[PDB]
């Protein structure tokens, strides 16, 4: 069950970078443009940082979870 740490970063980085960088140009020429661009850019920052922190916090763990023997017995069958 290997989630190789190249595809997730590529996917979400291009995703959020596009939202925060290309979307601003696609916002139409109008009065609310500035506020809309600020929403796009800062949403990119906040959400991308949240995801990046969450995934790096799991990259290279120091310890593994602790499980009741019942859930060990169950997940042993259920998950790969």
């Amino acid at each position: 069950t290997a989630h190789s740490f190249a595809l997730p970063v590529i996917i979400f980085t291009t995703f959020w970078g596009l939202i925060g960088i290309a979307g601003p140009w696609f916002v139409p020429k109008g009065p609310n443009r500035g506020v809309i661009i600020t929403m796009l850019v800062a949403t990119a920052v906040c959400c991308y940082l949240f995801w990046l922190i969450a995934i790096l916090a799991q990259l290279n763990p120091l310890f593994g979870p602790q499980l009741k023997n019942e859930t060990i017995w169950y997940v042993r069958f259920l998950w790969e």
């Binding site: 019942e70 859930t71 017995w73 169950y74 997940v75 069958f77 259920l78 998950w79």
Partner: protein
């Protein structure tokens, strides 16, 4: 029967929430999803021969959740009727 429009609105909203959540919960138990193991009523002697013995109880709780969702759907219908009267 009759009731206040605010009571009926609360009833219908609660019925919608209950129906959605309990249908989802029954689905997730019938799936045998692992994250809900602790809520299954199994006993310490059910861990001998394999997961089927506990799959059955997962199914039982899923049926309970579906029954509760049906009760909430009936409540939602009745509350919608009450709103229509009001």
């Amino acid at each position: 029967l009759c009731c206040g429009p605010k009571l009926a609105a609360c009833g219908i909203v609660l019925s919608a929430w209950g129906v959605i959540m309990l249908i989802m919960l029954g689905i997730f138990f019938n799936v045998h999803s692992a994250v809900l193991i602790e809520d299954v009523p199994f006993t310490e002697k059910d861990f001998e021969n394999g997961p089927q013995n506990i799959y059955n109880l997962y199914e039982q709780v899923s049926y309970n959740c579906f029954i509760a969702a049906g009760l909430y759907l009936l409540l939602g219908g009745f509350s919608f009727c009450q709103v229509r009267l009001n």
